[PDB]
Write a protein that binds this ligand. Structure first.
Ligand code: CLA
Ligand code: CLA
Ligand code: CLA
Ligand code: CLA
Ligand code: CLA
Ligand code: CLA
Ligand code: CLA
Ligand SMILES: CCCCCCCCCCCCCCCCCC(=O)OC[C@H](CO[C@@H]1O[C@H](CO)[C@H](O)[C@H](O)[C@H]1O)OC(=O)CCCCCCCCCCCCCCCCC
Ligand code: KC2
Ligand code: KC2
Ligand SMILES: CCCCCCCCCCCCO[C@@H]1O[C@H](CO)[C@@H](O[C@H]2O[C@H](CO)[C@@H](O)[C@H](O)[C@H]2O)[C@H](O)[C@H]1O
Lengths: 165, 165, 169, 178, 170
């Protein structure tokens, strides 16, 4: 009932060992796919953010007028304790603004996760149907891989073992 | 007013165990008496609350007699400490209102006191019924309360302010 | 209106007979009566506020070294205001009397209604209009009596009461 | 203005992730009654917590026999448990009397005679808007009271103490995971 | 009934630029802009009056910055005194407000709150109060602009200007 709808891959097809969507509810599957894609996008941003933050790359200048700079902010969870409280509030407020107003479907999309709203588009209509499905599958699987990768990075930050050379 | 079921609410509705009601005229007389008693007793209960809360005017009730407002008893004997000239003025005002402005002969008890939108009875008759029933029930509760207050002061010898102390 | 101001126990009280005679002037006469009633009600409230010593904290005219406490609470209070203050009062009320709420509008309906709203019930509206008229008449008599009492006794209402000079005998 | 379309407003509309509106339609009346009841109780609770942590307290003794003042009652979660047992018995007895006689909890539609400040809203859209406002404020207050209680338990200090200490950033402090 | 709204004595339909006939299709958003500016200016004028009357909260706006509510300047420089986090909170809250709760894109200005929670049933009374709102907004716009310009040119806040007696500019 839920075979080959962008979650199926040649290694393993419809893979639901818990049977959380086996009942065949389209709304529940749409909600789960929305959550999966949102987590995947956030995680594939977080993986590169963490990787280049731990590599020593820092935004040039000062993070605040009082004197602290981006170079003084450490890597990993320790960064959150050194971001200025005003800066942390601004980050959370910007993300909340995105959640409430920007990163949502308001005009109606052809699938779940399409937030274009007819405003920003780089030419997705240039792809054919097979190419569109391929790009969606690439995005989804990169999201899953990045979810597990950022989970591994956050786990190993707390562990004494590091996975980075 | 009998046909509207005013004063007959939950839990006991039309409650006349002694059969005092025989026609509409006797009900009108009894309801006028009950409504006047309820209004007087509600004012009396509010006055007792104000007295025993210690909220008194600052100054002299009768500067000629040196009687401050704080020298007046908060119990049932408080009014009898008012000088006879003050009692005469009170009785004169009460007689004037109850013979001319709010004549007691008006068995309907209606004197045109309308609070505008708070009595939007032309389009919310439910408000009219609710307010009439609330007035009657509060009057009954206040009658019982003032009787209980008088009984307490008689049997204990101390006013409500110091009975609870 | 003709029926407005008619109330028990007097009803239609025209001892000098100016209703059946010269009835075309009734509109302006009622406008004048209502205006005086409103003004006198405001004046009576003002006197009550004055003699209870509810005053603003500060200076009415710092250039004249005049405080709100220095203003007499009686009929001499209006005389203590500087000329510039009186001119400002006159200008503002010229605006509020010619432009806003014109005095030439004899019905008195300036669109403010009763506490910002129109009384939908015609009986309630008539009753409250009669209340306004009767209170205006009572306040006219009261303000005239207060002024005459202060002028004869030579002391403000606060001074009259505090001295115990109530009975004129 | 029926009960089925109340509480479905922007931006979520009819927001039923569990799908219980379509699979359990007969229980919706009771569920909406429970939701509105909890919303009202939580709004009262949030206002009460705001009053407590602002130290708006009565003057005198709540229980002179126990030598207990109103100011001695904590402004946090432990405040209701600091009330004497007789006081709690009186409170629950009065609340039960109200909920059984004056505002019967069995009245699922929530129309307890009174309206919005005693007035019935004859305008259908305005009535629906105010009912939706009640429901949304109840939901927000449920979340808020839960968050306040959980934050007090986690931080170990009441809302007033937490604000006085400047304990607002959950990340820079030495407590917890962050 | 919006095109005839805001038309009051003594000017009636005052349009010296002729834009009610030149651009009849822009009137909806121009009226929306006028109403929004009027409301903002009315709030601003009340705020200036409150500030210069020294009606301030007791305590610190930001205890970390050691900034009392009384330390904020009363005049136009008061907005500067608010720290970055406070301005960010104001911006976030009013973004939420003016994009969701009372969207600025609603050019009719009707956000369901009515006048003190009520809908004015009488058409003439409702029109009268809408005209009152518009005229008050225009007066408040003029007043807030005058207050800002007077403070900038005199160099002192309204409280200081009144206390020093510097009222007549001659
Ligand atoms: C590998 C990861 C990946 C992939 C494959 C995709 C793929 C897609 N995303 Mg997506 N996304 C990602 C990460 C990814 N995203 C992340 C991290 C976020 C969070 C910031 C988002 C947020 C996001 C939103 C909010 C939306 C999409 C949408 C889309 C689809 C429409 C693409 C489009 O407009 O045509 C693009 C057409 C082209 C011809 C491409 C133009 C060439 C680009 C602009 C230049 C880049 C060239 C350069 C070599 C690439 C560098 C890659 C580097 C950054 C790693 C497409 C399936 C939209 C959608 O579903 O609409 C259908 C949509 O609404 N995504
Ligand atoms: C936010 C996380 C998240 C969410 C909501 C989903 C949601 C979904 N995934 Mg998915 N996935 C994820 C992360 C996630 N995935 C990651 C990280 C991987 C890489 C291993 C995958 C790999 C994957 C495959 C290969 C397939 C799916 C499929 C699906 C869909 C059906 C399976 C299902 O019921 O969910 C799965 C169940 C859950 C997410 C809940 C489990 C949570 C409990 C608490 C365990 C957590 C353990 C954790 C490791 C700690 C559904 C839309 C299938 C699909 O789309 O077919 C159409 C499919 O074939 N997923
Ligand atoms: C045009 C809008 C705008 C403006 C004027 C500012 C202005 C400012 N930001 Mg900023 N910011 C913005 C948008 C903006 N931000 C957005 C959209 C984001 C999220 C993408 C951020 C995220 C951000 C962070 C993370 C930090 C700032 C900080 C600061 C302040 C510098 C340090 C400081 O407060 O000195 C006094 C400065 C006042 C810093 C700050 O507040 O440090 C105290 C800081 O750390 N900003
Ligand atoms: C039938 C009811 C009733 C009776 C018999 C009294 C009798 C009395 N009151 Mg009283 N009072 C009442 C209702 C009543 N009150 C109500 C409803 C209020 C709330 C507005 C008050 C508020 C009040 C104050 C604040 C004070 C009194 C005081 C007094 C005493 C001096 C007389 C006086 O100044 O009256 C004043 C009466 C009023 C201001 C309200 C009367 C309104 C009527 C009932 C309508 C006298 C024993 C004075 C005193 O010596 O206290 C011990 C005093 O300072 N009363
Ligand atoms: C509107 C109703 C009203 C009320 C309640 C009062 C009340 C009062 N007047 Mg009065 N008065 C009124 C109208 C009123 N007046 C009018 C219309 C006039 C004529 C313009 C006067 C002229 C007047 C004089 C000349 C005197 C009073 C005085 C008094 C006080 C003593 C009562 C007395 O002996 O009267 C008489 C008393 C406070 C006397 C006073 O102040 O006591 C020292 C006093 O000498 N009144
Ligand atoms: C109803 C609304 C509401 C509101 C206004 C608040 C308000 C507050 N809560 Mg709170 N809370 C609520 C409901 C609410 N709560 C509920 C329903 C619960 C659960 C019962 C809690 C549980 C809770 C806890 C346990 C704590 C608070 C705390 C706080 C305070 C600081 C919040 C903060 O900075 O966290 C910012 C967090 C967010 C904005 C949430 C975003 C989380 C995303 C999903 C991930 C963020 C983590 C991520 C890994 C890092 C990303 C970094 C990136 C931003 C750069 C603040 C007064 C904290 C406090 O007072 O301690 C100082 C605290 O410890 N709350
Ligand atoms: C909205 C109506 C309004 C009102 C009541 C005032 C009132 C005032 N303005 Mg003013 N003003 C206004 C609008 C208003 N302004 C506008 C729209 C502007 C911008 C052009 C100005 C620009 C302005 C300047 C530049 C000055 C005043 C000054 C003054 C004060 C002296 C009065 C005078 O004649 O000086 C004229 C007085 C308090 C003077 C002042 O503050 O005292 C020195 C002064 O110098 N005003
Ligand atoms: C928006 C403004 C209000 C924000 C309120 C935030 C409440 C949660 C606080 C919190 O999580 O603290 C931050 C939490 C708890 O913070 C804890 O603080 C402790 C000290 O008090 C210790 O430091 C702990 O280590 C630390 O974890 O940290 C997290 O990592 C939270 C993880 C995510 C939990 C769920 C977040 C939900 C966010 C709100 C969602 C709102 C949805 C709205 C939808 C609208 C749709 C149109
Ligand atoms: C019922 C409501 C009521 C009204 C509407 C009302 C109005 C007025 C007016 C305006 C028309 C005047 C001018 C006036 C004057 C005085 N009043 Mg009244 N008075 C009312 C009630 C009482 C009571 C209860 C007492 C009292 C007093 C006095 C004394 C003190 C005389 C003195 O100390 O010698 C004086 C001079 C006390 C008193 O009677 O003293 C024995 C006192 O006990 N008054 N009173
Ligand atoms: C726009 C409306 C608005 C809302 C709805 C709102 C809600 C909340 C809530 C939620 C219940 C909390 C918990 C909270 C907390 C703090 N606020 Mg708000 N706040 C608003 C506005 C401002 C402004 C203008 C300022 C300010 C401040 C602070 C500080 C001080 C930090 C410090 O100690 O320095 C703290 C702790 C000041 C500031 O951040 O200065 C750095 C300051 O300038 N806030 N604030
Ligand atoms: C903070 C609390 C301040 C005190 C609030 C007092 C009440 C004001 O609250 C407001 O009351 C008015 C009374 O006209 C109600 O208004 C009501 O008017 C009439 C009945 O009177 C109804 O036809 C209308 O549908 C209804 O809305 C509003 O719905 C409510 O918002």
């Amino acid at each position: 009932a839920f075979e080959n709808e962008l979650g199926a891959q040649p290694p393993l097809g419809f893979f639901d060992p818990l049977g959380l969507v086996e009942d065949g509810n389209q709304a529940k599957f749409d909600r789960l796919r929305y959550v999966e894609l949102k987590h995947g996008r956030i995680s594939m941003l977080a993986v590169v953010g963490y990787l280049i933050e731990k590599a020593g790359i820092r935004l040039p200048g000062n993070i605040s007028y009082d004197g602290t700079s981006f170079a003084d902010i450490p890597d990993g969870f320790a960064a959150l304790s050194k971001i200025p409280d005003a800066g942390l509030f601004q980050l959370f407020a910007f993300i909340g603004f995105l959640e409430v107003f920007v990163m949502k479907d308001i005009t109606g999309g052809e699938f779940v996760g399409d937030f274009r709203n007819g405003f920003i588009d780089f030419g997705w209509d240039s792809f054919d149907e097979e190419t569109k499905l391929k790009k969606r599958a690439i995005e989804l699987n990169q999201g899953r891989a990045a979810m597990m990768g950022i989970l591994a990075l956050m786990v190993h930050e707390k562990l004494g073992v590091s996975l980075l050379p | 007013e009998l046909e509207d079921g005013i004063g007959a609410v939950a839990p006991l509705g039309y409650f006349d165990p002694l059969g005092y009601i025989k026609d509409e005229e006797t009900f009108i007389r009894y309801r006028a008496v009950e409504r006047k008693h309820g209004r007087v007793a509600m004012m009396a209960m509010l006055g007792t609350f104000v007295h025993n809360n210690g909220w008194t005017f600052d100054g002299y009730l009768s500067p000629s007699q040196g009687l401050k407002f704080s020298d007046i008893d908060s119990g049932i004997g408080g009014l009898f400490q008012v000088p006879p000239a003050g009692l005469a003025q009170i009785i004169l005002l009460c007689g004037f209102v109850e013979l001319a402005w709010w004549p007691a002969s008006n068995l309907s008890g209606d004197y045109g006191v309308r609070l505008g939108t708070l009595n939007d009875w032309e389009e919310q008759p439910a408000k009219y019924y609710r307010q009439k029933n609330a007035e009657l029930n509060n009057g009954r509760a206040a009658m019982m309360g003032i009787l209980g207050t008088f009984t307490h002061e008689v049997i204990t010898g101390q006013n409500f302010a110091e009975q609870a102390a | 209106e003709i029926e407005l101001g008619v109330t028990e126990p007097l009803g239609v009280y025209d001892p000098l007979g100016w209703l059946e005679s010269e009835p075309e002037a009734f509109e302006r006469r009622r406008a004048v009566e209502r205006k005086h009633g409103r003004v006198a009600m405001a004046a009576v409230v003002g006197t009550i506020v004055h003699n209870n010593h509810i005053v603003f904290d500060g200076y009415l005219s710092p250039s004249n070294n005049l405080k709100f406490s220095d203003i007499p609470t009686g009929v001499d209070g209006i005389r203590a205001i500087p000329t510039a203050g009186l001119a400002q009062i006159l200008a503002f009320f010229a605006l509020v009397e010619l432009a806003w709420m014109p005095a030439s509008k004899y019905d008195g309906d300036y669109g403010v209604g009763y506490f910002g709203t129109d009384i939908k019930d015609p009986e309630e509206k008539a009753r409250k209009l009669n209340v306004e008229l009767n209170n205006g008449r009572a306040a006219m008599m009261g303000i005239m009596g207060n002024m005459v009492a202060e002028v004869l006794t030579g002391q403000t209402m606060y001074e009259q009461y505090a001295s115990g000079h109530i009975s004129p005998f | 203005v029926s009960e089925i379309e109340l509480g479905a407003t922007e931006p979520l509309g009819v927001f039923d992730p569990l799908g219980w509106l379509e699979t359990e339609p007969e229980a919706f009346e009771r569920r909406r009654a429970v939701e509105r009841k909890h919303g009202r109780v939580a709004m009262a609770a949030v206002v009460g917590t705001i009053v407590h942590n602002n130290h708006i307290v009565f003057d005198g003794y709540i229980s002179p026999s126990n030598n207990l003042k109103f100011s001695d009652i904590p402004t946090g979660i432990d405040g209701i448990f600091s009330v004497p047992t007789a006081g709690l018995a009186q409170i629950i007895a009065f609340l039960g009397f109200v909920e059984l006689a004056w505002l019967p909890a069995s009245q699922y539609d929530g129309d307890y005679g009174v309206g919005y400040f005693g007035n019935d809203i004859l305008d259908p859209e305005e009535k629906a808007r105010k009912l939706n406002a009640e429901l949304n404020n109840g939901r927000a207050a449920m979340m808020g009271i839960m968050g306040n209680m959980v934050a007090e338990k986690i931080t170990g200090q009441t809302m007033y103490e937490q604000y006085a200490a400047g304990h607002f950033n959950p990340f820079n402090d030495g407590e917890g995971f962050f």
